[PDB]
């Protein structure tokens, strides 16, 4: 129906006023409700309340084209309740925290002047020096890059008893899984260190009061997943499963010492019924992970009025739990002006 | 010797009226002279006002003992 006139649409028994924007899945018109999320690659500094961390600067980092699982890195300060206040990091795939200067030594810079050049951009304010000194103090025992990498690797998911295995595992974690939006290739440790020092610097500024803290519900801190990103998130997993079943089929047909039919190797029903299932049920994942996945992403298009159809096609969703009793995500934020209707919202649990 | 209240409680009134109405509906002998009456509830109410319901209320004290009050012995509020 793309580019058809009103007469051509009426020839096909279609309504010219129908806006489209939905999918016909098994004769059911299915609309993809836009899902909001925190913006990736942006450093947000919050105050975790009643916790061991006074401040926390997170950066949900995503590669922006490859779109692996978004690897959040936290750079936190400990609460006062020790001879100072201390900055630590929470790396992905490292189940324990790491103090930040050990991470900077693992990235290649061994000296303290180099690390503080990556963190503190003007040396002429000593108030910010006073806060980084404890972090330099508990990284005193670590003065070399491989020693720091061993410190990283001895806290990983499965620390292999070989020391060089720990070194290689730590190098892989700090290259591919720490701040991948900065870069995942080699020779990217200076840019990763500059961005990590930027995260530490933002945390220091927020702890100094020199910069205000970030708002969870500021709507420039949010992004909306429309039909494109949602369907691409599905299609990445289903194409991964397609390549997995092709490698399984071809492996089974080369252990036998034969040749495989590649046109018969492709399991074309992996993409087909996977997309069809997720759009028909609304659970956004696989069939075997229905509880794990989130529901209500795909809804039946409401066709009671033209206005209800148009409203359903322009609906957003904050996926925060509907049994949540905190008022703040349900507040009408100031930053919704002109972007989100201040009047249109449901009554009740949502 | 009977320490409970001489008045009939509202729960006692409701249950005596219900029990007596069911008895009349099961063709118990009416104690009063019904005058064109048919509904067993009105007959039970007319028996209750006339203090003629042949029912004993057994009130249980919390210690385990009981007191037997006849309906004709209790003061009829409503």
């Amino acid at each position: 129906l793309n580019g058809l006139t009103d007469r051509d649409l009426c020839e096909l028994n279609e309504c010219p006023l129908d806006p489209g924007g939905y999918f016909i899945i098994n004769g059911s018109e299915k609309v993809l409700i836009a899902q909001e999320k925190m913006a990736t690659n942006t450093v947000y500094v919050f105050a975790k309340k009643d916790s061991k961390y006074a401040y926390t600067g997170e950066c949900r980092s995503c590669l922006e084209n490859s779109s692996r699982p978004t690897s959040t890195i936290w750079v936190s300060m400990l609460a006062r309740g020790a001879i100072g206040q201390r900055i630590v990091a929470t790396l992905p795939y490292i189940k324990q925290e790491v103090p930040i200067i050990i991470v900077f030594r693992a990235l290649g810079f061994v000296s303290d002047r180099d690390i503080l050049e990556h963190i503190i951009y003007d040396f002429e304010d000593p108030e910010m020096m006073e806060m980084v000194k404890p972090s330099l103090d508990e990284a005193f025992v670590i003065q070399e890059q491989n020693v720091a990498l061993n410190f990283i690797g001895s806290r990983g998911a499965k620390p292999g008893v070989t020391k060089e295995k720990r070194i290689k595992y730590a190098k892989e974690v700090l290259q591919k899984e720490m701040l991948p939006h900065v870069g995942v290739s080699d020779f990217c440790e200076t840019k990763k260190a500059y961005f990590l020092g930027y995260m530490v610097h933002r945390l220091l500024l927020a702890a100094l009061g020199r910069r205000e803290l970030d708002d969870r519900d500021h709507y420039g801190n949010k992004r909306l997943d429309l039909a494109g990103p949602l369907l691409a998130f599905l299609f990445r997993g289903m194409f991964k499963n397609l390549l997995k079943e092709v490698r399984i089929y071809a492996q089974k047909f080369i252990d036998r010492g034969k040749d495989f039919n590649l046109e018969l190797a492709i399991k074309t029903r992996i993409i087909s019924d996977g997309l069809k299932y997720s759009l028909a049920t609304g659970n956004w994942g696989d069939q075997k992970k229905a509880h794990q996945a989130r529901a209500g992403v795909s809804q039946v298009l409401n066709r009671l009025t033209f206005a209800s159809t148009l409203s359903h096609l322009r609906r957003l969703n904050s996926p925060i739990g509907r049994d949540g009793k905190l008022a703040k995500p349900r507040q009408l934020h100031n930053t919704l002006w002109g972007m989100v209707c201040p009047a249109e919202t449901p009554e009740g649990h949502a | 010797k009977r320490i409970t209240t001489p008045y009939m409680t509202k729960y006692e009134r409701a249950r005596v009226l219900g029990t007596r109405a069911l008895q009349i509906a099961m063709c118990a002998p009416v104690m009063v002279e019904l005058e064109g009456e048919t509904d067993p509830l009105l007959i039970a109410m007319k028996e209750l006002k006339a203090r003629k319901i042949p029912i004993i209320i057994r009130r249980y004290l919390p210690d385990g003992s009981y007191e037997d009050w006849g309906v004709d012995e209790l003061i009829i509020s409503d």
């Binding site: 008022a327 349900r330 002006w337 | 409701a14 509830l41 919390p62």
Partner: protein
């Protein structure tokens, strides 16, 4: 698993033993009916022709039940089953062989629900024991349950789509105990707060304030038409208050006929001046604002929510305590019927003309808002130029916000009172406010004078941008417009920023409604389960299920909460 079968609100215990689906229940939309008594519910014919009461066959009702069996399940005033003594059910929907339609004494006939049948009628959430009362069935044509209007206050019901549930008691014993314990007239006064739960509401309240004013004069035909709707009327037309030049009755005479027995009550109207009772006209009231009902006759006074409402010591309360539930039920019905039929003569509207003040009042309102905004600018200039010194206990921010909020609240209150003084005695907003029927004075102020300050989590509108509430203001603007003080009324309409700030303020009530309904219900359930077995025993002690003494006498005095009243100790306060 079995544990998952037994646990939760949906498990076996809470979802199938404490509460369960029941037979002989009905549910449909509720619509008003001013013509029903307070203990009647109007039932659709399809609901009644589907719900059956098992009537035991006696020689008293052999013929009536024989006719009901002969009519069958097709005709509505008919029957659905015959249950013999042995217990088999002869289904009357198959029109069976005529040997089956024989009725002996001891048979049960499951006749259709008819007029006068007792039902429990219920609205969820069932919060208190007046949310589930007994009603007499009246069969009415269309498809809704129909309620009286005084009854919607205990049910917390209105007719914007509410549905209520109708349970039919199936035994004579349970029908009798609903009749003797849970009917609507017996549920008039609550033990929770020793006042009525149900009072004169809405139209009848507005029109009984209009009806009992001093200058309401009814002619002969109007009086006879109103006396047609008085059920307790003795057939004697009262002597008119004015006989010459023409015979005219006042509204107080007709209401004195409505008032039952010889009730003795003294109230004051909502607009009673504070300095009148000390004045020379203590008993000769210039504004008719002191209500005196003496020997069941409205001597003087305009009736309102203070007299005919759900307050303690009101006219319906005194009527209950002195006359009983049946007389007070008739009182409720008579007020509603007579007043609703007089409202056909008088009428009651609300228009766009009632929301409009004179130009002098508009000028006064604009002057007050302008001077208050200038005061806020002066406070801002004092805080900028370091002159603002904190009050003890607070820093400069709570004192600046307190000063600005005090200026703006004094603005809203002063200009709302300026708006309310402009309202004539013909105003309909004022008619519903000073009668207590609907709306308050802040509603009049917001509609006419100024909406006021919008608040999010108690403070003013927060700086959701970088130090701006919206990108239409400059940074660090603490003035009234910037932080959510709506300067216009609803009549004048809001500016776009005021519209957004008002939507931010109004979202708070919606969120609060949702979360309070989530949490308060859990609190109520925990309250119930902690005390469900506590009861007054026959030695008058209050014990729990363990027979542990909770109170040696109920309430420490041994009395029930319904019959007690607010009284005054004479000897406590005066000097020796």
């Amino acid at each position: 698993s079995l544990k998952q079968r037994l646990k939760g609100k949906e498990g076996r215990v809470r979802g199938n033993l404490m509460g369960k689906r029941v037979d002989f229940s009905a549910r449909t939309v509720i619509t008003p009916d001013p013509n029903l008594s307070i203990d009647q519910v109007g039932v659709p014919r399809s609901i009644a022709a589907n719900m059956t009461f098992a009537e035991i066959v006696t020689p008293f009702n052999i013929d009536r039940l024989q006719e009901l069996v002969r009519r069958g399940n097709s005709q509505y005033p008919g029957a659905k089953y015959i249950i013999r003594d042995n217990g088999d059910r002869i289904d009357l929907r198959f029109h069976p062989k005529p040997s089956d339609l024989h009725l002996q004494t001891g048979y049960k006939v499951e006749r259709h629900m008819c007029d006068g049948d007792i039902v429990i009628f219920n609205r969820q959430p069932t919060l208190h024991k007046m949310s589930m009362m007994g009603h007499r069935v009246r069969i009415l044509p269309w498809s809704t349950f129909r309620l009286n209007l005084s009854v919607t206050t205990p049910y917390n019901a209105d007719f914007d789509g509410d549905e209520m549930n109708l349970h039919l008691p199936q035994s004579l014993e349970t029908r009798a105990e609903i009749q003797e314990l849970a009917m609507v007239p017996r549920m008039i006064v609550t033990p929770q707060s020793n006042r009525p739960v149900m009072g004169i509401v809405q139209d009848t309240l507005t029109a009984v304030r209009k009806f009992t004013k001093r200058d309401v004069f009814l002619e002969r035909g109007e009086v006879m038409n109103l006396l047609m709707f008085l059920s307790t009327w003795d057939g004697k037309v009262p002597q008119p208050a004015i006989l010459k030049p023409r015979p005219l009755w006042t509204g107080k005479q007709i209401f004195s006929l409505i008032i039952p027995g010889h009730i003795n009550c003294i109230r004051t109207h909502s607009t009673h001046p504070d300095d009148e009772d000390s004045g020379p006209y203590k008993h000769i009231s210039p504004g008719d604002t002191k209500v005196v009902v003496e020997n069941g006759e409205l001597i003087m006074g305009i009736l309102c929510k203070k007299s005919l409402g759900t307050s303690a010591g009101s006219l319906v309360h005194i009527s209950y305590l002195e006359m009983g539930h049946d007389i007070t039920r008739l009182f409720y019905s008579n007020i509603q019927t007579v007043i609703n039929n007089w409202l056909l003569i008088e009428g009651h509207t609300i228009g766009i003309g009632d929301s409009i003040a004179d130009s002098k009042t508009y000028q006064d309102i604009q002057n007050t808002i302008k001077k208050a905004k200038q005061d806020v600018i002066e406070v801002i200039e004092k805080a900028h130029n370091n002159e603002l010194e904190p009050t003890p206990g607070n820093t400069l921010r709570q004192t600046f916000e307190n000063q600005v909020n005090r200026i703006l609240n004094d603005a809203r209150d002063k200009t709302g009172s300026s708006a309310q003084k402009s309202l004539s005695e013909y105003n309909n907003f004022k008619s519903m406010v000073v009668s207590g029927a609907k709306g308050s004075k802040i509603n009049i102020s917001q509609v006419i004078a100024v909406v006021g300050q919008q608040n999010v989590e108690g403070k003013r509108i927060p700086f959701g941008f970088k130090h701006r509430t919206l990108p239409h203001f400059i940074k660090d603007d603490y003035g009234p417009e910037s932080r959510g003080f709506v300067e216009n009324s609803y009549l004048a309409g809001l500016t776009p920023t005021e519209f957004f700030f008002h939507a931010m303020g109004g979202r708070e009530g919606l969120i609060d409604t949702a979360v309070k309904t989530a949490e308060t219900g859990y609190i109520q359930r925990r309250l119930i389960k902690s005390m469900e077995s506590v009861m007054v025993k026959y030695d008058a002690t209050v014990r729990n299920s363990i027979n542990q003494v909770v109170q040696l006498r109920y309430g420490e005095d041994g009395l029930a909460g319904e019959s007690v009243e607010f009284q005054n100790l004479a000897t406590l306060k005066p000097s020796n």
